[PDB]
Amino acid sequence: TNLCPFDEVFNATRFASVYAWNRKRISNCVADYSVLYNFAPFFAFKCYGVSPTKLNDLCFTNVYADSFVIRGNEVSQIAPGQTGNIADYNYKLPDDFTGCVIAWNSNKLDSKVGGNYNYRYRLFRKSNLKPFERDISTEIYQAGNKPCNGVAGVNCYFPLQSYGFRPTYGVGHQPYRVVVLSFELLHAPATVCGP
């Protein structure tokens, strides 16, 4: 039986930065949702508009697995109607979100002793992101009234900042892997089911 590749999305060697969240299109496969815990105890498991289990029986035309990494304090922003740095400038969910949010701790995975500055996040942006919008622009943000001319300087800052995760950080500042599952309903016949 051709099942869905959740092992690629969840057990990935490297997760993307939150400003460049990675989306995987899942279709033409059987999705096994009755796995409660696949890595560690359930850390963050919040299905909005749908039940967690006893509901894998639903069929959808496509499943969307959006993966990224944030610090624990920001895991609260991956929810409908949230605000903050991530929710505004990095990753936005609609108010009528009918999907699920699965986040877990990765301090053993993404915490380098000398600081893991490979994960970036967007701090500055001229407008809040539309739901499920992605923006990857290494363009100098113009906070002042003078033009930046693509150079960082006085009132001209680079929009990205490194998390610099460290193994000794507090739980609020530790690396957390997040995966958002969206379920699409189209006129086409369903391609993802679990019987």
Added chain:
Amino acid sequence: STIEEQAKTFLDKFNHEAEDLFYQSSLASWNYNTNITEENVQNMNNAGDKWSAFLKEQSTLAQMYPLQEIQNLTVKLQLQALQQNGSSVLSEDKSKRLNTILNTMSTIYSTGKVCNPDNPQECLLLEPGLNEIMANSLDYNERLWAWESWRSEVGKQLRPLYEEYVVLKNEMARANHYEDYGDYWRGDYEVNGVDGYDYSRGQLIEDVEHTFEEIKPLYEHLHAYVRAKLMNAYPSYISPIGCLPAHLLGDMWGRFWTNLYSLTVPFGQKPNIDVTDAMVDQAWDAQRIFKEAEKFFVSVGLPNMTQGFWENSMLTDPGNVQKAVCHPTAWDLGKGDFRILMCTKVTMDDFLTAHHEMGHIQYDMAYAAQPFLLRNGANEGFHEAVGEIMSLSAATPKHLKSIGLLSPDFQEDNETEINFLLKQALTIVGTLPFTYMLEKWRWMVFKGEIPKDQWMKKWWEMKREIVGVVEPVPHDETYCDPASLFHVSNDYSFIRYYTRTLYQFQFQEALCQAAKHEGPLHKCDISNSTEAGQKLFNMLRLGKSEPWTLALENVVGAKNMNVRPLLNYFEPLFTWLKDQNKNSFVGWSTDWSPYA
């Protein structure tokens, strides 16, 4: 866009960059202080230099936002913090000379040795030799030798360095729009912008003097009592109406009269409340001590310590293989990393100091949500005041009984209480005239009111007039006795201890009234008082966001420093002294000297 919005965005970028750089510097300095090696010292100095360079870059950047155009108080405070400019306003050579003399004074203080007690091969440093003498010796001549040797050796070297230090620091402070270096130091207490909570830099002097004036009588009676008891100890050496000789006060300077307790104990027949033997007999360890402190803080509504704290900390002596610095310190590294560095032994003193340092840590956790430059006490006295109220609550016999380290049938007579209040006063009230006079002398020197050719003259005049202490041998301008103290020769302000001593009893009074406590203030244990916990947290969470006057009002209900909490804490001892001195002289003549 407005200047305020530009400054806000600048501060966001700054906060996240400085959080990370400060965390690296803190990790490096922790690896040094817990594991003294050469690799660690090089990493610590590298990280610290990186942090200082980043700070100077950010200062030059933040100077571009005209403060006057900022209408948001918080952004104004952070911008001011970046706008220090401190010493940078000096030319390169003058800054180099200032750093040179600072390090030289620090070196001569931490390295000065005096030789030839009998043979020039026997030499002692301040710690532990000279301090052991000044603490335990009962020999007038031995104490005088230690005192005069320390001064005539290290202070004579320190004198010219200190004159140049004064002149350079005044140059810096004046270039930074201050009157003198004393005005710079007093700027820590300045509040400018909040109607009804403002505070000028001279208002500190006014308030400090008005409150020391109110402190004067209790200190006078304590001084008379200690003088009589020392006359019993040094009969042919002490006048019943003169100042106390400076070398008989219990330490190198007289900053604390704690080590005079053996010579001044009211009722030496009563047992002292040292619960060390109980802790040892109950098989307590450092784990249990810090767990009990955590239980104390949780009992008033504050959180436990973090799992990061419990895993990442040195709470015991690491042994002979790994040597570390054992001065108790509370580390707030940022990014939710909280630690305590302490070589804990199973003693009551270490129990109380653990309570003090964990109070520090609770303060740090409580203002963690504040922006970076605002994660600090309201002023320089607040942190130590919080730690000290923790240790006061922990030292009460009521608390000791409730934890099970003191027998339930230990009766608190009025003589164990008078003993306890006297031992508290020797340290707490004995230090206030010392602190005030030293800081007054520095203020006046920086202000240019004491010429160099009578520096020591005014120093000892003030000693006599203010502290009631007289030098055992005369000193000309070759000496520099004020610089023979660590804080003076290492460029640290000193009024913080006075302000913290008044603040701590304000806080204790407020929280014990909140805790519905009954009786004398010194018997108060705020354990199990969620009201007191909340009243303290309302101030702790503020950090340096609100003015220190507002933070103090939040807990005690007053916008200014107050002396009546301290006086109410010491009232029973005050009446006992007033009775004990009925046929004794209270006060002192400023003219008697032990050397004609």
